[PDB]
């Protein structure tokens, strides 16, 4: 595989988001860490698909609603930031207030 360290440690997001995704399917309200992991995985897989950075800053705000997380979690997730390999190289994606409405 020839995995660098930065690639290996990003597999943590994949597993954590997998845990969050299963719990959401059971009807559980996501906590702070589950919500952050799930939103991050959407950005990472979206960048692999070839979406623009601008698109992901807006589409990551529709992953989770307020009613899908525990009380106060939406106010706790002020910003989520992650760098993924876009077709044009590694870029930074910042999501502002992803859990709204």
Smallest separation (angstroms) from a second copy to the CB of 36:
5
**66 in contact with a second copy (CB under 8 A):** no
Contact stretch for a second copy (CB under 8 A) within 17-25, 51-59, 61-69, 88-96: 17-25
Residue 16 interacts with a second copy (CB under 8 A): yes or no: yes
Among 24, 34, 38, 99, binds another protein (CB under 8 A): 34
- Report how far residue 66's alpha carbon sits from residue 5's, in angstroms, rounded to the nearest whole number: 35
Q: Are 81 and 95 in contact (CB under 8 A)?
A: yes
Residue 74 Cβ vs another protein, minimum distance, rounded to whole Å: 9
What is the C-alpha to C-alpha distance for residues 15 and 8, in angstroms, rounded to an integer?
A: 12
- Which are the contacts of 34, defined by CB distance < 8 A and separation ≥ 6? 16, 19, 20, 23, 24
Q: Please choose which of another protein, a second copy, none residue 18 contacts, taking the beta carbon within 5 to 8 angstroms, the exact cut-off set by kind.
A: a second copy
């Amino acid at each position: 595989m020839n995995l660098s360290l930065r690639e290996v440690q990003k597999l943590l997001i994949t597993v954590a988001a997998d845990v969050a995704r299963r719990r959401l399917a059971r009807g559980l309200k996501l906590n702070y860490s589950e919500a952050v992991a799930l939103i991050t995985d959407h950005v990472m897989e979206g960048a692999r698909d070839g979406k623009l950075v601008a698109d992901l800053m807006q589409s990551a705000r529709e992953v989770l609603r307020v009613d899908q997380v525990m009380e106060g979690v939406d106010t706790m997730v002020s910003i989520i930031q992650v760098e993924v390999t876009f077709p044009d190289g590694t870029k930074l994606v910042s999501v502002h207030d992803p859990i709204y409405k």
